[PDB]
Design a binder for this molecule. Structure first.
Ligand code: NAI
Ligand code: NAI
Ligand code: SWL
Ligand code: SWL
Lengths: 256, 256
């Protein structure tokens, strides 16, 4: 289908949701490039995947997504190695309200820069044969959170940018589809950032609320988030859609 | 009431909506500091206002909101001159998709930096007697726009940050209220930015759509937007609310 024999570039694939994405894509029969700033974690992940699939179907590149030149050298290294780019996934993110400027830079700016860098290669006008770009958001992009003000700001921006760029691409005859995912609580190391003042700052005194709400709702395993990505990729007529994943309902879509 | 004898700091007050805000506040009996990066326009505005009100109620400081140190030096210059800060309005903004990074920096980052600088002075925990912070957004912060992708991203983030910070302030016992305004098309020079590829880039070929939309939706006078800010200020029990101004309906509130 639209997965076999296709090249995918995934950001933040050393651990967690990105690693699950890469595993699913490799299982479906694709060639994957893994981008992360943590070298040891990425190398260990590649070694782990090399025990299941063939080594060539995988590549690892170290890069900080905030630095634009690194991303541009990363996109060019991938294309010169495989031959074409067909799937892009922008998933890297952090949580830090003390250093709220770096969080905004990583979460929001890098997504837009990657989206643009990807349209520069995948577009019909520039010689491409189309493809699909997916940007990762959170339920914090649709509801407010008292203890994560700057983090909420970034997810909302991601949602708006994705929705606008979908229509823009439809107008330009680019052959590219754009969609976003909005998951709930996921069992990853990021949750541990809640319990440390270095990441929370003046909001640490109110972490018990988030702890209680996690106890209420529950946590979702990283593999279930990946199936949603695969579902997005194989559907041809999905552009500008927002996916919500919840433990109570499942995979559903926001309505406007 | 809560307007007389109070100090207000307004950003982007040289021309347009900010100037209307300043005029309304001065008419109601307040002392106003005008912040803009255009020196000539600000000086001319201050001279124009000096012909109506007393000079001692008007202060003009020329600062770029993006540079944090300038913003910190402006806030301290304002307090050391008057004596206290009671109202803050973050209204400065631009529209440029070609240089989409500077637009994001000006529209979103500066708003958060100013809100935080303002809470550092207005909060009871730090010796203050409270006050009100207002951040300017657009209807593009609630609906997508094909030709203004990065601009749409900046307004959504503003809305999310304001909604979260309102609850955060309610929890901390700060005595500060936070709300935002989401106007429609307003008769200002910013509209002229649509007709220039310098400000639009690859999206210039699709400006005719906005042109028809501007004509159909009509236009709103800046003093009418100023009547909304005053309404927000005099209402004590409004925190975390979003105002929408339209030519068909009027002044109304988003519901969640
Ligand atoms: N886990 C959760 O509860 C939720 C997470 N998300 C989002 O999911 C995405 C993935 O995060 P998780 O896997 O949950 O967390 P994680 O912390 O386990 O993984 C994030 C990955 O991003 C990488 N990364 C961070 N900044 C980077 C940078 N500047 N350059 C390159 N790589 C960078 C890290 O090395 C790490 O491998 C993030 O955007 C996060 O905000 C959204 C919904 C909820
Ligand atoms: N006019 C409209 O149709 C709408 C405008 N808005 C928003 O209203 C706000 C006010 O803009 P308008 O009065 O309409 O436009 P305008 O272009 O007439 O005025 C903007 C003002 O901001 C100042 N400014 C811009 N960047 C600055 C910076 N970095 N530092 C200091 N001053 C800076 C400019 O000198 C100017 O005086 C903006 O945030 C805009 O996005 C929202 C709804 C629609
Ligand atoms: C850095 C920490 C990463 C986790 S956040 O993006 C995140 S995910 C999430 N999911 C939910 C769910 N609601 C219903 C089913 S699941 C809720 C929250 C959340 C936490 N605090 C609030 C006010 N909210 C809305 C959050 C929340 N704050
Ligand atoms: C830099 C130009 C500044 C004007 S933008 O923030 C702005 S204000 C506005 N207002 C409206 C109104 N809708 C109903 C009554 S008024 C519509 C738009 C707009 C323009 N293009 C679209 C798709 N939209 C939604 C816009 C729009 N794009």
């Amino acid at each position: 289908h639209m997965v076999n024999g296709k090249v995918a570039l995934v950001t933040g694939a050393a651990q967690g949701i990105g690693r699950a994405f890469a595993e699913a894509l490799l299982l479906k029969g694709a060639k994957v490039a893994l981008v992360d700033w943590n070298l040891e974690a990425g190398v260990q992940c590649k070694a782990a995947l090399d025990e299941q699939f063939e080594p060539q179907k995988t590549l690892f590149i170290q890069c900080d997504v905030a630095d634009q030149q690194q991303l541009r050298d990363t996109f060019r290294k991938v294309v010169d190695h495989f031959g074409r780019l067909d799937i892009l996934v922008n998933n890297a993110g952090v949580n830090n309200e003390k250093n709220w400027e770096k969080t905004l830079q990583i979460n929001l700016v890098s997504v837009i820069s990657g989206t643009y860098l990807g349209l520069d290669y995948m577009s019909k006008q520039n010689g491409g044969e189309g493809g699909i770009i997916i940007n990762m958001s959170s339920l914090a992009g649709l509801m407010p959170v008292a203890q994560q003000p700057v983090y909420c700001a970034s997810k909302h921006g991601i949602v708006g940018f994705t929705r606008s760029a979908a229509l823009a691409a439809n107008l330009m005859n680019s052959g590219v589809r754009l969609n976003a995912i909005c998951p709930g609580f996921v069992n990853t190391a990021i949750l541990e950032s809640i319990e440390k003042e270095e990441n929370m700052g003046q909001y640490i005194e109110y972490k018990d609320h988030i702890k209680d709400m996690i106890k209420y709702y529950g946590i979702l395993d990283p593999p279930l988030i990946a199936n949603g990505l695969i579902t997005l990729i194989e559907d041809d007529a999905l552009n500008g859609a927002i996916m919500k994943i919840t433990t109570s309902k499942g995979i559903h879509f926001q309505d406007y």
